[PDB]
Structure formats: C-alpha cells, structure tokens
C-alpha cells in the first residue's frame, strides 16, 4: 500500500530524468560536459531502478493483487519489456516480471548504449582534436606557392597513439567477456562498421572498429618521404579529402550509436509510463 505510492513516485522520478537525458542526446555536438551530464542522469535512473526493484520484490512476495483492468494496461508496454497481461500468471510472478523488465531494459539497453556512446564520443573528441591541430604539421614548402610541406611522421605518430589509446576500449560489453556467437549478434544488430569482434582472452568483445584511422595511416604511408614530404596543392587536396571523408564516417558512426541510445530511452519511457498507469490502477 505504502509501497505502491513509493513505487509510483519512483516511477515518475525515472520518467522525468529520462526526458532530461533525451534532451542531452538530441544535441548536435556531444562535448565532455555533455557526457558528464549523461553519466549523472544514468546513475540517477539506476538509483531509482534499484529502489523500484526492492519495492516490487515486496509486492511480489506479499502477493499484492493487480486487478484485471490494471493488468490489461500492460499490453501497451513496449514489446522489448516482454510484459503481457493477465492470461494466467500469479500476482507474485507479475510483480517480479515487472521488476526484471525495468532492470533488463536499464542493464541491456540503456547502460549498454550509454557506454558505447561514451566510448566512441571520447575517441571522436580526441580524433577531432588531432584534426584541429592539422595546420601545425603543414608548412608552405616549395618557393612558388604551389606546394605544401607535411610533417608526415609527426602526424603519423599522433594518429597511431590515438589508435593505441582506443585499440582496446570496448563498445560492448563495458567490462565482461561474451561468447563469440553473442558478440557477433550484438555487432550484427549494430551496423557492422562501427565495431569489430575481438577475442579478449577467455571470451569475446565488440571493440571499436579502427578501420577509419587505419585508412588515414595508410594514406600517410603512401605519401612516402622520410619525415617530411612536399605535396603540390592538387595532391594536398586529394589527401585532405580522404582525411575529411573518415571524419564523416566516424561522425556517422557516432550518430548511429546515439540513435541506438535514443531508441533505448524511448523503450524505457514507454515502459515507465505504462507501469505508472498500471500502478495507479491498483
């Protein structure tokens, strides 16, 4: 009885926080500040999820009844939550089934894509920082104004430590390992390009796909030279185009991850709302 009102308040708390999170994700450019806010909102959602998980265990073992009408509301719950109403399951089971749905959506959807977005964002921010410093490695060169001199080795090392830094940082899961079949199944449902399956000791992991940065490093290797190379403006333009093309690729990959994260919020929002309606009807 008191649990219900506590749970209903906890559920609305989760709804507002979720909406604040969605505003953070619709922003054009995710900054370090943006990631910090996203992190806070997520830890708040987990705080109320645990609070909810304990109130539902109470309702489950007490066998608080969810009346016919109230159960039918659950049919509006998102298909991802795997909540249907009524048919034949006890009050104990339904309360537990609701707690699992909240926790599973938060653990397998929210937290997962919140980490993926965080990982790829941090990498892209460091990548964009290298591109911002690109003029530092470019010099006039030839005395006619038709050439430019590129510090190929410096720029090469800069991109290679970028790769070294995120070479291991996984997209999914944030820490643990996963079976080959499941790591592939998470990658196949992501978009193939963003991530790569890699064996992290006893198990597997979906790690950041470094092909965009490997493509840039190979463009630099194909320039030759021994530290510095003189490029005519036409060749500089061609090379520079390749670099900006991979920036668009990674920008695109990041937008895809943020969309998966955004889609997860929509799932969670739909569930929490439906649960509030069901709670209010008991």
């Amino acid at each position, epitope marked *: 009885v008191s649990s219900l009102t506590m749970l209903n308040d906890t559920l609305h708390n989760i709804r507002t926080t979720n909406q604040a999170l969605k505003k953070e994700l619709s922003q054009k450019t995710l900054t370090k500040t943006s990631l910090e806010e996203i992190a806070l909102h997520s830890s708040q959602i987990s705080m109320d999820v645990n609070k909810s998980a304990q109130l539902l265990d109470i309702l489950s073992r007490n066998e608080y009844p969810i009346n016919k009408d109230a159960r039918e509301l659950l049919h509006s719950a998102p298909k991802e939550a795997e909540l249907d109403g009524d048919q034949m399951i006890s009050h104990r089971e339904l309360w537990a089934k609701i707690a699992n749905s909240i926790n599973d959506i938060n653990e397998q959807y929210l937290k997962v894509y919140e980490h993926a977005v965080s990982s790829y964002t941090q990498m892209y921010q460091d990548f*964009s920082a290298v*591109l*911002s*410093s*690109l*003029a530092g490695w*470019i*010099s*006039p*060169g030839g005395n*006619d*104004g*038709n*050439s*430019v001199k590129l510090q190929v080795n410096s720029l090469k090392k800069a991109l290679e430590e970028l790769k070294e830094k995120y070479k291991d940082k996984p997209l999914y899961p944030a820490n643990n390992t996963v079976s080959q079949e499941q790591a592939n199944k998470w990658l196949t449902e992501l978009g193939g390009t963003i991530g790569k399956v890699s064996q992290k000791n006893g198990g597997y992991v979906v790690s950041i796909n470094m092909t965009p940065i490997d493509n840039m490093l190979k463009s630099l290797d194909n320039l030759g030279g021994n530290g510095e190379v003189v490029l005519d*403006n*036409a060749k*500089y*333009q061609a090379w*520079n*185009a390749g*670099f*900006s093309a991979e*920036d668009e690729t990674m920008k695109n990959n990041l937008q895809t991850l943020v969309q998966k994260y955004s889609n997860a919020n929509s799932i969670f929002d739909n569930l929490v709302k439906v649960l509030s309606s069901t709670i209010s009807s008991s």
Partner: nanobody
Amino acid sequence: LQLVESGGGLVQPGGSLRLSCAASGFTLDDQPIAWFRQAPGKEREGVSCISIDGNTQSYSDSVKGRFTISRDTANNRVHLQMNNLKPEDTAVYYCAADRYTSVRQMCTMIEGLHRVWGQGTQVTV
C-alpha cells in the same frame, strides 16, 4: 564569384576595428577562411584563420590576444575583431578562401593554399 572586405578606416592607437568578409555567389562556410595583411612595402603575411566548423581559430604571433576571428553563417560572413590596435598594424587587409582544404576542424595561413581573394580594405593606426 567575389570575395569582399569591409569595416576598414582610420583609427588611432588603442582603438578598435571590426573587419567583415562577405561574398557573392560563394558561401564562406564551404572552406577555411583566412585574413592576410600587407604593409605598403613589406611582404604579405597571415593574420588569422577560422575552420569550416568555426570551432578552430589561429592567429599570427604578432596578433594573438588582441584579435578575434568568428563566422556569421546566418548572413554568410566572417568577422575579424581587432582590438588595441597598435601602430604597426597599418596595412591593406584581405580575406581569402582556401578551396583545397576540406577537413572541417583545421585552417592555415599559408598564402599558397588561398586562391580566392578580396580587393582589400585599408587600415591605418
């Protein structure tokens, strides 16, 4: 296709000017933009530059801290806010477009890369 500067004129030491780069049949947003200046009998030098996305700005050594470059994508313009104008800055100021570069976070002051130039506006201190 025309690059076009404005905002010049005669000011005294410690004063300020706000140069503007505008264009016809040409969007300054499509490539990096730089400001050059040339005193009457000296070599043309670079002053500052701004990247395509506007989040990156560079300034020559003899200009840092005092000047500020920004983009006005709304009206398709680039501004150069020159503050505490010391007498050395007397020169014709040009804004130029580097059409070779396509990376959006970078900008250079290399004259050879800029092939679209404005007429220039006189500044005197």
